[PDB]
């Protein structure tokens, strides 16, 4: 909820600094992705409604323990609000924040030898919207600049013209580009008037709608409940 509410590059990067990797990953096994399933949408049809499970559905799915699984889990958290199930990551990586995993060399993780085309295919980039596409490219650029693979990032953008049009305009090493950036990246937010409490056809659309509807209640009643648990505890 908090990650999807951020609407600026500054706010998104600030949030990733304060958020440990534990929030990105999940401890629920979920189901295997890329499965043609029939779900129930009784609002519209009596028959079952076909759909395909993906990594950006907003529901935890099983993921491998390699470097790609950890990166895919982080990107899913940014664009869908929920991560995947990577078994036994270890306390050493869980305490580190998301940005250090993306943009630092002290994590002990070798993020080189990463193919952005393969990762984009696995995350179903063809199904995500402009804001989700923009957030995914931000993670790619941070990973590319840390490992000195700026050429491979440019090659990926050249092959994908639609992604090149909406590419973020910041440079990871320069602070001036971050402050002057005018991108809008807010998936959820408090809307003028309201939105009907009705279901949607797709798994992604319905889960995204559930986040928007619950944001208003989460905004008002989160400070006290979080503080009660935060008090008398040490942060990871």
């Amino acid at each position: 909820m908090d990650v999807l509410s951020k609407g600026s590059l500054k706010e998104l990067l600030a949030h990733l600094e304060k958020t440990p990797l534990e929030e990105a990953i999940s401890y629920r096994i979920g189901t295997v992705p890329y499965q043609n399933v029939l779900i129930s949408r009784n609002e519209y049809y009596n028959q079952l409604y076909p759909d395909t499970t993906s990594l950006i559905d907003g529901v935890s799915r099983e993921g491998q323990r390699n470097v790609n699984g950890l990166i895919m889990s982080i990107i899913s958290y940014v664009v869908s609000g929920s991560g995947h199930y990577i078994p036994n990551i270890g306390f050493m990586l869980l305490r580190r924040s998301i940005l250090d995993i993306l943009t630092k060399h002290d994590t002990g993780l070798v993020t080189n030898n990463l193919n952005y085309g393969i990762i984009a295919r696995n995350l179903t980039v063809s199904k995500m919207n402009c804001e989700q596409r923009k957030r995914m490219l931000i993670c790619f650029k941070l990973l590319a600049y840390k490992d000195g693979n700026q050429n491979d990032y440019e090659i990926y953008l050249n092959q994908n013209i639609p992604l090149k049009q909406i590419a973020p305009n910041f440079i990871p090493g320069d602070m001036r580009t971050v402050i002057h950036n005018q991108d809008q990246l807010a998936i959820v937010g408090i809307p003028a008037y309201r939105l009907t409490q009705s279901t949607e056809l797709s798994i992604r659309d319905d889960n995204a709608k559930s986040y928007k509807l619950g944001y208003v209640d989460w905004y008002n009643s989160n400070s006290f409940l979080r503080e009660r648990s935060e008090f008398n505890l040490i942060r990871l």
Partner: protein, 100 residues
């Protein structure tokens, strides 16, 4: 031209001008872009959400797409299995003529 000026001002968020051309404003650009995205999954789909929400707030109409029905007179002929020596031809969609 008073009625047209009011209507164009609401649609395009700008007054009509004699020297300038009447494109329709940002609503025209958004409407063209969403049409491109609807046709194929390879379309760019570039128009952001903040533009979509700001244009839906101009009028108060529900987005219900299931409150009525329409009849489409197209003839689906999935397959016409034919033995040897028999020749079958399917012509047309609105009215399918099968010659055997």
């Amino acid at each position: 031209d008073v009625p047209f000026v009011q209507a164009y001002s609401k649609f395009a968020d700008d007054n009509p001008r004699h020297l300038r051309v009447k494109t329709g404003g940002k609503m025209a650009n958004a409407l063209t872009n969403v049409i491109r995205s609807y046709y194929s999954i390879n379309a760019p789909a570039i128009v952001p959400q903040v533009e979509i929400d700001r244009l839906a707030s101009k009028a108060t109409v529900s987005g219900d797409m299931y409150n009525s029905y329409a009849i489409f007179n197209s003839v689906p002929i999935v397959e016409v299995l034919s033995p040897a020596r028999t020749t079958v031809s399917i012509v047309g969609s609105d009215r399918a003529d099968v010659t055997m």
